[PDB]
């Protein structure tokens, strides 16, 4: 006879009420002691609520694109809205991605976001060289910086411009994939 359980307390204390009302990003969390869902002062007007992992990654990527951080080399920036990637489109996936890239992206939690991350990397590299994207392979290891490897006509095109190294950074989330490629001679 307890389907209905009246709340004794709001999820906030009287002291936090106004703070909760005034922060649109305030969320409850499990209180370790009570086990109940409450607002904790640490999650009210907290930077972590607003500045997420994708924001931190993307800001770092374009911080490593400022003239003082790195200059004297081809810089390519690509963004892909992940909704643009049809992972069922076997034609587009087989044409533009290597079996290693397809295996890596398929194994990730969001396949679509990972493919968008890889497509954005390939297109950012192509823009950095300045000359199908299967020629440009992105080798991705978990919590490690991705590596660029030029195989077919992309390798020849890089040799023409005297490109020694190509490095790429990738951020991707539920909305967009951003890739910054720096090609150095």
């Amino acid at each position: 006879n307890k389907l209905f359980v009246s709340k004794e307390h709001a999820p906030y204390t009287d002291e936090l009420e106004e703070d909760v009302y005034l922060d649109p990003l305030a969320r409850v969390s499990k209180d370790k002691k009570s086990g109940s869902l409450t607002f904790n002062s640490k999650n009210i007007q907290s930077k972590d609520s607003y500045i997420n992992a994708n924001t931190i990654e993307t800001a770092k990527m374009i911080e490593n694109m400022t003239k003082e951080k790195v200059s004297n080399g081809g810089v390519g920036v690509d963004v892909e809205l992940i909704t643009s990637i049809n992972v069922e489109n076997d034609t587009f996936i087989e044409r533009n991605f290597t079996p290693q890239e397809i295996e890596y992206c398929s194994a990730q939690p969001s396949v679509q976001s990972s493919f968008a991350g890889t497509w954005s990397a390939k297109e950012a590299v192509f823009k950095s060289l300045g000359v199908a994207l299967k020629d440009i392979e992105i080798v991705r290891v978990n919590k490690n910086a991705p590596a660029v490897e030029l195989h077919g006509n992309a390798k020849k095109a890089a040799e023409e411009a005297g490109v020694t190294d190509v490095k790429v950074s990738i951020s991707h989330d539920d909305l967009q994939a951003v890739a910054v490629a720096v090609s150095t001679k």
Binding site: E18, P24, L25, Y50
Partner: protein
């Protein structure tokens, strides 16, 4: 065109947690929080009401960085009309206009 005007003109702040609904509403016309000159208060002449309402308006203004020295001017129409329950806001809105 209307959707673009809605995105940039009317609804630019709806997805922006750094813009309060109150601030966005005024910023649509190029007004700031300092341009809210008058607050028509519910102002019912009850102990609880008039304090809570003042505290609420005051907290809204503080949170949105209303300039020190720029209080909203309170209007309390019910001194004259009394409290007509459901019509209360409508008389206040007419006053406001």
């Amino acid at each position: 065109l209307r959707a673009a005007q809605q995105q940039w003109g009317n609804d630019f702040y709806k997805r922006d947690p750094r813009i309060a609904p109150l601030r966005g509403a005024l910023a649509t016309y190029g007004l700031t929080i300092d341009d809210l000159g008058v607050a028509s208060f519910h102002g019912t002449s009850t102990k609880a009401n008039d304090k809570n309402e003042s505290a609420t308006i005051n907290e809204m203004m503080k949170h949105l960085g209303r300039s020190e020295g720029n209080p909203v001017i309170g209007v309390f129409q019910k001194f004259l009309t009394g409290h007509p329950k459901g019509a209360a806001g409508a008389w206040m809105m007419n006053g406001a206009l």
